[PDB]
From Swiss-Prot:
It comes from Homo sapiens (Human). Hydroxylated. 4-hydroxylation appears to enhance protein stability but is not required for miRNA-binding or endonuclease activity. Ubiquitinated on surface-exposed lysines by a SCF-like E3 ubiquitin-protein ligase complex containing ZSWIM8 during target-directed microRNA degradation (TDMD), a process that mediates degradation of microRNAs (miRNAs). Ubiquitination by the SCF-like E3 ubiquitin-protein ligase complex containing ZSWIM8 leads to its subsequent degradation, thereby exposing miRNAs for degradation. ZSWIM8 recognizes and binds AGO2 when it is engaged with a TDMD target. It is linked to Lessel-Kreienkamp syndrome: An autosomal dominant disorder characterized by global developmental delay, intellectual disability of variable degree, and speech and language delay apparent from infancy or early childhood. Behavioral disorders are observed in most patients. Additional variable features include seizures, hypotonia, gait abnormalities, visual and cardiac defects, and non-specific facial dysmorphism. This is Protein argonaute-2. Residues 85-127 are annotated as: Interaction with guide RNA. The lineage of its organism: Eukaryota, Metazoa, Chordata, Craniata, Vertebrata.
Amino acid sequence: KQFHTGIEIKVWAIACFAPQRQCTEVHLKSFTEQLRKISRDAGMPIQGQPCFCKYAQGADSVEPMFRHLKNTYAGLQLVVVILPGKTPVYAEVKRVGDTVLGMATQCVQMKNVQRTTPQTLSNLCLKINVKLG
Ligand SMILES: Nc1ncnc2c1nc(Br)n2[C@@H]1O[C@H](COP(=O)(O)O)[C@@H](O)[C@H]1O
């Protein structure tokens, strides 16, 4: 519905389910910096430095990674999950986050990490605003 003010995202993680050869460390850093700058300008600042950033492969890797994050990072507010197109990883991410460990997740397509637009960054900011606001 309406846009929420006073969101600060201080503790968040990236779980990259895209293969590193397609979605590289510099894609991740660039995507993050852009998200930092637009979230800042909208008054919902996402700190530039995620507390965790790792590559993973398969739905099977989701629950153990999320258990690890929950057990490791006090005050974790959000996991940003990067998906290489349509994959059962999405449903597992939402099973574990929404209905097992009570962990906010935001999924994003790999193509929107490889190449950002103001518009796709805005889409993401609004989805995140609704989740954490
Ligand atoms: N089966 C699926 N596989 C991959 N990405 C998916 C998917 N279903 C959905 Br919805 N998505 C992606 O999930 C994004 C939204 O994730 P959230 O539900 O965390 O907001 C969409 O923008 C879309 O790109």
